[PDB]
Structure 1
Amino acid sequence: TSLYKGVYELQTLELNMETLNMTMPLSCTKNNSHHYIMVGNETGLELTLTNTSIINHKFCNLSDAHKKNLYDHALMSIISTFHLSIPNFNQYEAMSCDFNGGKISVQYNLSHHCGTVANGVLQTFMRMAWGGRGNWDCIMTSYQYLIIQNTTWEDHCQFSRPSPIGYLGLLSQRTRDIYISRRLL
């Protein structure tokens, strides 16, 4: 097929990353709009770019979630890494959360010229999923909202192979581009 020089051959590898389901979360997507992160073989999360909002309240009850430790620690760490890698995040009105019962729900409002929270939030989306008219490090999408939410595990990511690299890379940049909101911190 692909023979180079006289004997070297372009044999390729397709690493089955499901073998890392027991230690690392894997990212894969279905139709370029439904991205997914699966941790273990029992739980995962939806990442849906859509015009429909499941949440109509501007709250994120994080300290209430930590008070009642009834959630999965892996998922909360995943979303913590996701939220600490958002470049120059400064508008807290956009983010909305739901954690009742241990469910993981996070909605983002991508409403807007550039220098918008939508820019950085899409940036960290493609930092994580690696699946995807904007220029000069500014990206715009017709989708008004994005939803992250808890789900069971299936094989519903035909479009993309599962990979952990998105989360491992996102761990690097957490708290890197954060703004100061208090002097003492």
Structure 2
Amino acid sequence: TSLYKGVYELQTLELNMETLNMTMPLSCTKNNSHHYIMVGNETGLELTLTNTSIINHKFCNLSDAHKKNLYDHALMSIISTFHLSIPNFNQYEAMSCDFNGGKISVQYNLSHNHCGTVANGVLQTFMRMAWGGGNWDCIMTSYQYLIIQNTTWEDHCQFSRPSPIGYLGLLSQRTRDIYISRRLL
């Protein structure tokens, strides 16, 4: 109905990204706090911002998880990409995990210049990962925990459409801002 130069009618299209599900992961946002990344039609990860922690120990037994080799390889790959993308992560106590039985549960304790804290790096990475919704690029929230757990497929994308863009963009961020912890990497 909108006519430009008298001869050019303006038209739009919207891509149904959902059809990419078998060849790339799809991230979406349910609301401010809840976000999902689905891999195929059967499994995925739920990312929750929450005041209720679910892990009450200081362990993250990654090597035992690898040796047991019970987890889903795609989910562990995604988790690794997320963690390697965090900038300036230097408080290993802030991350606790549970992999018993092959499940994937990772919890970041965000409680405490506020910019140079684990909470900021974690939240920036989370913002990049779902890309769905302080000084310089600094982010702060009121949430005490970020929890990442495996989940089955369900139509979660109420606030934003599923998209692989965040994950693909984050792929290049891996190891970009990691610190050296020993002289021999």
1-structure distance, mates of 2:64, 2:79: 16
Runs of 4+ in structure 1 off by over 3 angstroms are none
Shift of 1:15: 1.4
1-structure distance, mates of 2:17, 2:183: 44
Where does structure 1 lack aligned partners over 5 or more consecutive residues?
Answer: none
Q: Deviations over 1:35-88 (max 9, x none)?
A: 000001000111111100011111111111110111111000000000000011
2-structure distance, mates of 1:3, 1:63: 63
Normalising by structure 1, we get a TM-score of 0.95
Q: Deviations over 1:89-132 (max 9, x none)?
A: 11111011111111111111111232101011011001110122
Where does structure 2 lack aligned partners over 5 or more consecutive residues?
Answer: none
2-structure distance, mates of 1:3, 1:65: 61
SS of equivalent to 1:93: helix
Alignment of 1:22-33 (within 5 A): 22-33=22-33
- RMSD value over aligned CA atoms? 1.2
Normalising by structure 2, we get a TM-score of 0.95
SS of equivalent to 1:142: coil
Shift of 1:18: 1.5
Structure 2 CA distance for partners of 1:144 and 1:12, relative to 1, 3 Å: same
- Paired-residue identity, %: 100
